[PDB]
Design a protein around this ligand. Structure first.
Ligand SMILES: [Ca+2]
Ligand SMILES: [Ca+2]
Ligand SMILES: [Cu+2]
Ligand SMILES: [Cu+2]
Ligand SMILES: [Zn+2]
Ligand SMILES: [Zn+2]
Lengths: 151, 151
């Protein structure tokens, strides 16, 4: 698997489509998210692709290596920590991330896992609260989708 | 992954939750689907876990061995051919299937692919037209979901 897609939906107006593509040793994540409050929103891969209880059943961030919550460029970060997406005034967040830790195959494969867009910005583990080292204080999960294999 | 789950949703009333568990060397599929018309409905694993155009974007049946469509008991069948599920008079179908071809890891893995419940009965590759050898004449996709990793 070299391509993947996620359709984000929640109990509200947030909705979006993320495309993943394996390019070399990185995964290029693109797509757009809408219905967002302008600003930064925590954007993470949660461990389970279980949507039976909304985004709630997606579990914690995907952290196969048992590291602490960080931002994408940190070394001490969860595999799922893709930091933040930014909604403009109109509520539109354009996603364009290149990540070397997430994968479409193997052990860090995120296929079958959940992409979650959060209510608040990810504090990147630099919040000076324990909550920050676990989730980045991104709060509630607005929309989420299971990452599936794409053509 | 030893457990997977799929939440089926469509444009109509058909919905359900399907659980998959690797038990021994096989995969047990259980769950229930409601909102269906009484009678048989094709139930297949489609190739892509792409819900960008509803269930249409799931692609054809998952068929890594390039075979024609058949019933779950046939030698000549697609890996995604799980036959029919049967809805009682209240539109409830209880799913209980053990399948030797699907898997939750490796080449036959259905993680990240789409579970689809169809409008009509799957003719198990025996209807006698070309469409039977491709889809079993199961018709349109009532509900579908991306198969994700469960805890
Ligand atoms: Ca909150
Ligand atoms: Ca039909
Ligand atoms: Cu998160
Ligand atoms: Cu089908
Ligand atoms: Zn994290
Ligand atoms: Zn088939």
């Amino acid at each position: 698997a070299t391509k993947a897609v996620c359709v984000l939906k929640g109990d509200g107006p947030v909705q979006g489509t993320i495309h993943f593509e394996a390019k070399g040793d990185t995964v290029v994540v693109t797509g757009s998210i809408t219905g967002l409050t302008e600003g930064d929103h925590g954007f993470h891969v949660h461990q389970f692709g279980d949507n039976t209880q909304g985004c709630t059943s997606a579990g914690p961030h995907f952290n196969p290596l048992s590291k602490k919550h960080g931002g994408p460029k940190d070394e001490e970060r969860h595999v799922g920590d893709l930091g933040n997406v930014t909604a403009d005034k109109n509520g539109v967040a354009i996603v364009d991330i290149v990540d070397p830790l997430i994968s479409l195959s193997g052990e860090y494969s995120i296929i079958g896992r959940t992409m979650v867009v959060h209510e608040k910005p990810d504090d990147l583990g630099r919040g000076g609260n324990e909550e920050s080292t676990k989730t980045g204080n991104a709060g509630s999960r607005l929309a989420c989708g299971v990452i599936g294999i794409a053509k």
